[PDB]
Amino acid sequence: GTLCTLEFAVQMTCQSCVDAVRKSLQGVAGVQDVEVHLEDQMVLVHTTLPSQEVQALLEGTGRQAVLKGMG
Numbered sequence: 001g002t003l004c005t006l007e008f009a010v011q012m013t014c015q016s017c018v019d020a021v022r023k024s025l026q027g028v029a030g031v032q033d034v035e036v037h038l039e040d041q042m043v044l045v046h047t048t049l050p051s052q053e054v055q056a057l058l059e060g061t062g063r064q065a066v067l068k069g070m071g
């Protein structure tokens, strides 16, 4: 698997949940970096993981996640 930006749409509305997704994402094996956009309700994930896996990882933050595509 090679490094790419995954651009996901997610269910959140306040600043504590953004940070909870960022800290569920932080330190994961196969993630380089992230950028989280509460203003688009979007999540960028710079990763070698399959987007099927990152969806189920994002789902592990208590909310739904739907991919839009790659950067």
Ligand SMILES: [Cu+]
Pocket (backbone or CB within 6 Å): 013, 014, 015, 016, 017, 018
């Ligand atoms: Cu919140």
